[PDB]
Every structure is written in C-alpha cells, then in structure tokens.
A and B are shown apart, each in its own frame.
Chain A
Amino acid sequence: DNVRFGLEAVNANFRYCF
C-alpha cells in the first residue's frame, strides 16, 4: 500500500510516499 508501479517504448515509473 502507498506504493505504485507501472511499466507501460517504455514509460516505467513508480512512486513511494513517506
């Protein structure tokens, strides 16, 4: 929880909140 990932040439990214 409170974490998001994505991959989707590519658009790979993620967010991690404190």
Chain B
Amino acid sequence: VKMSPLPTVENQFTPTTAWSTSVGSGIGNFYSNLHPALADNVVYAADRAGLVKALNADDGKEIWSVSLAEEPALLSGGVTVSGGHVYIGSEKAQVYALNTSDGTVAWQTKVAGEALSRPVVSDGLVLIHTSNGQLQALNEADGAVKWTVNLDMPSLSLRGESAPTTAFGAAVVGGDNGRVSAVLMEQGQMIWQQRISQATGSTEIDRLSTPVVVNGVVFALAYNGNLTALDLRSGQIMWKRELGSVNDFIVDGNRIYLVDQNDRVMALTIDGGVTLWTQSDLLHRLLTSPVLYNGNLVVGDSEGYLHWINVEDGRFVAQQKVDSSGFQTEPVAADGKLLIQAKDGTVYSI
C-alpha cells in the first residue's frame, strides 16, 4: 500500500560503528519504550526476556550482568538511572529498584498495572505511570507508595503515557484522554487540567503518546495532531498548531524539531505554528525519536539505517546501514557519545 524511498545521500566523512555487543535476544516485534541509558561511563541495557547488563561505554566489554527472571520477567519501560539506584518497570505490575554499583535487588513493589513508561526521579520521589491510566509516586528509599492519581482510560491506544516532567515542585502529566495536567508532587494534588485533542469521529482517534517544559511554558502534542504551547501554571493556551506527530520531539535553540506521523521531519519556531523547514524524503519510512548529536540531527528507522541531517536546513548529511534487523526504539546520546540498541538485542556505540 506504501513504498519506502531510499534517497541518495553524499555521506559525511566517515560514518562508523565504534563498538557493538549483544544483549540477550532483543525486543523483536514487541512495541515498547525500552532503551539503554548512560551513567558514569557505564551503559545500562536490558533484554525484554529479563537479562540486564552494565557495559563499559568505551569498548562494549561487560562489567556486570544479572537475570531478574525466576514465566519470563517481561521487563519493559526503559532503564532509568538516578545515580543512586537503577529503576526498571515491567508488564507484571512490578517495579524493580537495583543498586547502581552492583545490581542486586534493593526492593520491588506492585503498582497495579503494566509500567509501560519511563520512570523518573525527582525531589526524593520515583514517579511512574501504568496502563490503567494510573499515575503513582513511590518512595525512593524503600519502594513504598506515597500517592496515586486516577484518570480515565478510553478504549483507544497502546501509546505509553509519558513520564511526568517535574519543575518547581509539580509535574506535568497526561494521558490517552487527549488531556494534560499539572499535579503537585508533594501530595499528589491535581493542580490543573486541559484538553489538547479535538476530534469528531473521536472513537477511532488515539489521544496522546511527552510534555517538554521550558521556563514558564509547557509544550505538548496529541496523537490527533494538536500541537499546543500552554501556561506552565494554568490551562491557559499560549498558541496552537494542527500537525500530526506521535514521537518525542526536540526543543532547543528556540527551534522545535518534530517527527510527523507521515515520517516528515519538521523544524518550527517557538512562538507559533510557524514552519521553518521540512524534510519530506523520509515520508512513510518509519522513523524513531530524533536526537541532536555533535550539532547534527540524528534519526533512524526500522530498515536498519541511521541518518544525519543538517540541523539548519533539513539537508541530508549522511546515510548508513548499521543493523539489518531495524530500530524500533528510541536512540540516545549523552556526554558526547551516541548509543543505540537495535530491534534485536544488540547494543551499539556509534
């Protein structure tokens, strides 16, 4: 029904793999938000089957490895490292807290639902979200539950609801209702709510994937294509645009970089629904979340290719095939290093 074009690209000087190693079998055909994390020059990664490793970030050598399985563990949600502890979610409604130095189990708690979300840590609390539309905050110390907020869950999507983004004592959250809200983190008290999605035949339209917080303004988009800038402390709208995109977007340089639901790449301004440029040649070729690495825009897709794009005008910088299995997860970059985990269970340093 659709074809995927393969543009001709005049490649950058030397695209190359720095190292690679396998980590179990891989996510395979399961959709998830599981991705590696870098901390203290150690790359933390896991296989869905339950094998969790810490690798040496410079050459792929193993440093530490455990298995959390006894059914399989069914681990998901992504590796979060707080410096003190490593937090991992699951589809068995379990939350694991492992030590960062030597990863034995520090604690595990039941959270009443699949943790198809990235855990985050702020102000001494571990903020998680589950598939029942439940926002829950755990005690960082021992895994105790501190509070919950219960939102409705329409029979719509499998999109993971984003991790809460906390600023000034309260976090922005949202869910597959087409609504976003701000909740006070000290008590779990709801501060304000607003609806972003607008639909007619709404029963066939998914609502919401990831809020981005800047000083005084919160940016968020809905599945149905509503891109909105809101007042940080209220439901007051700063501006809206209608544009279709699901995946995590980059806000920086007073620029917004989006990946459209048609796999278009777009650069917008921050003061309105104003387009600066688009790269349409990737249309309908499934794209993953973008990152900015060494000043270049780095994207990839399910074919197994990575692409480098000129951050100022959309011009292609490079195209390279790395792994024939494809990339179904979020690419990451930190501390000058660009890391990616393939659909199959191999972690690469590029």
Chains A and B in contact, CB within 8 Å: no
List the interface of chain B (C-beta within 8 A of A): none
